[PDB]
Amino acid sequence: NVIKMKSSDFLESAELDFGKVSLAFHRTQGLMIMKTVYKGPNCIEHNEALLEEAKMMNRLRHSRVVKLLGVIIEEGKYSLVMEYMEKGNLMHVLKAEMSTPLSVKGRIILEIIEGMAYLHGKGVIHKDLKPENILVDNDFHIKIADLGLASFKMWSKLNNEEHNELGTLYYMAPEHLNDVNAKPTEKSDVYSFAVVLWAIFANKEPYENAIAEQQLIMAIKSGNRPDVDDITEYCPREIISLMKLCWEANPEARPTFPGIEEKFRPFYLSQLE
Ligand SMILES: N#Cc1cc(N2CCC(C(=O)N3NCC[C@H]3c3cc(F)cc(F)c3)CC2)ncn1
């Protein structure tokens, strides 16, 4: 189960730049990442609901999914504690000086598929899958995160409130662009994966980093996708077909993550590893 943590369990903190994200040295359980979602007056009205939600998110246990280690539910001070990921996010690793070989990239892809197929299996629909939500360890292994709290309703409300003393649309499925009421599905995440797949090979953010505008939104809704020819490095035929299939306008035409795994695992083993 979830650990109810005290600020006294930590030796000290190293605050950095949404939300106060401090690196924290725990007394016995090691190095950890902490997010102080709220600081201010007491709000005993939501403590039971916040604790229920953290217990819910704490039930998510997989090798390729970020582990929620604990919570700090103190008077007027709320915090979420996750594990430490040394190499930061997927975009940071791709935009680095050092090139990441095809074998590593192909492993990264397989690990994303696995983590997403686990989440979907537990009924979790990500809604915000993007390179910033994919964290990397020192050994280039990845874990899927929900850093923007899109799957925490109670804790997302704390982060954005009056009493507190404190994104990109390129990966968004077109059924959600200019349609905030449609309920997201497993196929909404499959679309996001397709653009993550592109970004892994282009080593950059899509659509020339043009501010999300009505012109761009309408173009993606019409059928516009990131420029495949903007990929300079070697990208196998199979991976270009996969991304083109996953970013299909019709959600019903996109595969499932267990479906993607069944075809991608043999391809990685025989051709990429
Ligand atoms: N900045 C920042 C930041 C965040 C943070 N959190 C704790 C981990 C949370 C988290 O991601 N998860 N929790 C358990 C399963 C996992 C999870 C993954 C996923 F893909 C979807 C999902 F619904 C839940 C995200 C919030 N702690 C510290 N610092």
- Catalytic one among 9, 128, 146, 189? 128
Of 84, 119, 134, the last residue of a domain is: 84
In units of Å, what resolution does this entry have?
3.5
Helix axes 237-246, 257-267, angle to 10 degrees: 180
Q: Which of 52, 113, 62 is nearest to 242 (CA)?
A: 113
- Distance between terminal CA atoms of the chain? 36
Would you state the structure tokens that stand for residue 15, as one six-digit string?
Answer: 């605050």
One DSSP character per residue, 196-212 reads HHHHHHHSS-SGGG---
Check whether residue 112 and residue 184 sit in a common domain. Answer: yes
* Structural contact between residues 49 and 196, judged by C-beta atoms closer than 8 angstroms: no
* Binding site membership of 116 for ligand 1 (Cβ less than 6 Å): no
One DSSP character per residue, 139-170 reads TS-EEE--TT-TT-HHHHHHHSSSS------T
Check whether residue 164 and residue 196 sit in a common domain. Answer: yes
Of 69, 84, 99, the last residue of a domain is: 84
DSSP 132: G
Which residues, other chains included, contact 231 with Cβ-Cβ below 8 Å and sequence gap of 6+? 198, 201, 202
Check whether residue 92 and residue 28 sit in a common domain. Answer: no
Check whether residue 158 and residue 260 sit in a common domain. Answer: yes
* Binding site membership of 134 for ligand 1 (Cβ less than 6 Å): no
Check whether residue 74 and residue 106 sit in a common domain. Answer: no
Gap between the Cα atoms of 126 and 181, Å rounded: 16
Gap between the Cα atoms of 116 and 135, Å rounded: 14
Task: Report CA-CA distances (Å) from 32 to 40, 84, 164, 267.
Answer: 23, 5, 23, 35
Domain of 168 in residue numbering reads as 85-273
Of 39, 68, 84, the last residue of a domain is: 84
**What is the number of domains present in the chain?**
2
Tell me which H or E stretch contains 250: none
* Structural contact between residues 133 and 144, judged by C-beta atoms closer than 8 angstroms: yes
Check whether residue 204 and residue 247 sit in a common domain. Answer: yes
Check whether residue 237 and residue 167 sit in a common domain. Answer: yes
- Assign 3-state DSSP to the chain and report helix, strand, coil percentages, each to 5: 40, 20, 40
CA of 66 to the centre of ligand 1 (A): 6
Gap between the Cα atoms of 166 and 58, Å rounded: 25
Check whether residue 4 and residue 99 sit in a common domain. Answer: no
Extended beta strands in the chain, E state? 3-4, 10-16, 20-26, 30-39, 68-74, 77-83, 134-136, 142-144
Task: Report CA-CA distances (Å) from 10 to 23, 25, 81, 93, 264.
Answer: 10, 5, 11, 29, 42
Nearest CA to ligand 1 atom 22: 146
Q: Which of 193, 91, 80 is nearest to 135 (CA)?
A: 91
Q: How was this structure determined?
A: X-ray
